[PDB]
Design a binder for these strands. Structure first.
Ligand SMILES: O=c1ccn([C@H]2C[C@H](O)[C@@H](COP(=O)(O)NP(=O)(O)OP(=O)(O)O)O2)c(=O)[nH]1
Ligand SMILES: [Cl-]
Ligand SMILES: [Cl-]
Ligand SMILES: [Cl-]
Ligand SMILES: [Cl-]
Ligand SMILES: [Mg+2]
Ligand SMILES: [Mg+2]
Ligand code: NA
Ligand code: NA
Length: 326
DNA sequence: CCGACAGCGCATCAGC
DNA sequence: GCTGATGCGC
DNA sequence: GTCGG
């Protein structure tokens, strides 16, 4: 955290462009800049020094100079003092409420947590659950609790069918000491790119996890992706653990590596890797890596037997999960 | 200067 | 009912 | 907002 003040600023700017300005490219520009500076091993002394890094342009260089000199950014000072912007940024912190819905509610006068609770009828299912656990979803999950959750999920899945393989990905797989949520990759031999020999593969797992009262709510659910809420069991006389967000993704077993690569992230790392892939003549998604024909159209899936194989195709030295936190 | 900026699942809606 | 566009999230 | 060509 040598340049914590600077990356925080960029992150706030990014959030402003996404939530308030609805300028997604600026949002990603600020995030990339924050990401490149976050791994820079020196305490930045000036915007010029920063401009040397890829992703940091003139505009950001000037802001970094203003920040280093005064310790703040006038542009952000004003944004903070602006009711509308402040309200919109806040409402987007509720899962299910995005920039559009946030601005829509703010236009209706609904701009505080209190307002949301009294107008619960104006929220869809997801937003309603996000509001319900607003506080809990803000807390981090210690890795020790993640290990507990992992044991529960792997053991409950095993009980449904010994052939299932549940892998915890996301920040957890990257070795994080704390995670925002739990991300679970799921595979079963009956579900491949060639066929789905068994229906409800994801449903059954969800069902079992709900039966043992691990999963408490559902935000969204389909044939291959479950988005919900879970909670560790507490002991007698013991205070209850906070409710946690849990994501489960069922991927074709023969496409596990592209899947675990995707789900392990980070998101910025995935963006960088997928962008680099293109420059090399390939396109990567969570299922496959395909070559790009002279017309730009994606060819057929290339053989893959490990995460490393994907890195080789794009001429990138393999990077352990723990080093993909960009 | 200009176009590119990663890729996709689920929920909701408009138009038919 | 369907398809396609859009919002939101991973 | 930044970048390559
Ligand atoms: O925009 C996105 C979001 C997520 N992802 C992938 C990578 C990410 O690591 C994974 C899980 O998403 P989360 O939002 O759960 N993030 P992560 O687990 O990395 O961190 P956190 O501790 O915040 O959950 O999904 C993308 O590829 N693109
Ligand atoms: Cl933009
Ligand atoms: Cl500031
Ligand atoms: Cl694969
Ligand atoms: Cl594909
Ligand atoms: Mg996660
Ligand atoms: Mg997640
Ligand atoms: Na730069
Ligand atoms: Na939100």
């Amino acid at each position: 955290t040598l340049n914590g003040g600077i990356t925080d600023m960029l992150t706030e700017l990014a959030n402003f462009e996404k939530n308030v300005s609805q300028a997604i490219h600026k949002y990603n520009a600020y995030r990339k800049a924050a990401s490149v500076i976050a791994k820079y091993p020196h305490k930045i002394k000036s915007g010029a020094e920063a401009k040397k890094l890829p992703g940091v342009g003139t505009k950001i260089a000037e802001k970094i100079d203003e920040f280093l000199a005064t310790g703040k950014l006038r542009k952000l000072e004003k944004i903070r003092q602006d009711d509308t912007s402040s309200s919109i940024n806040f409402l987007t912190r509720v899962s299910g409420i995005g920039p559009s819905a946030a601005r829509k509610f703010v236009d209706e006068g609904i701009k505080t947590l209190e307002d949301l609770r009294k107008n619960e009828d104006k929220l869809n299912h997801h937003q309603r659950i996000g509001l319900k656990y607003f506080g809990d979803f803000e807390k981090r999950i210690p890795r020790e609790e993640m290990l507990q959750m992992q044991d529960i999920v792997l053991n409950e899945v095993k009980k449904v069918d010994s052939e299932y393989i549940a892998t915890v990905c996301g920040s957890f797989r990257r070795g994080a000491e704390s995670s925002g949520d739990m991300d679970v990759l799921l595979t079963h031999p009956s579900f491949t790119s060639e066929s789905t020999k068994q229906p409800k593969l994801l449903h059954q797992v969800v069902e079992q996890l709900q039966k043992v009262h691990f999963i408490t709510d559902t935000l969204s659910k389909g044939e291959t992706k479950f988005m919900g809420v879970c909670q560790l069991p507490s002991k007698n006389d013991e205070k209850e653990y906070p409710h946690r967000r849990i994501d489960i993704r069922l991927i074709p077993k023969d496409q596990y590596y592209c899947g675990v690569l995707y789900f392990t992230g980070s998101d910025i790392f995935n963006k960088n890797m997928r962008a680099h892939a293109l420059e090399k003549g390939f396109t990567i998604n969570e299922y496959t890596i395909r070559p790009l024909g002279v017309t730009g159209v994606a060819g057929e899936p290339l053989p893959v037997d490990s995460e490393k194989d994907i890195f080789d195709y794009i001429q990138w030295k393999y990077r352990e999960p723990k080093d993909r936190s960009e």
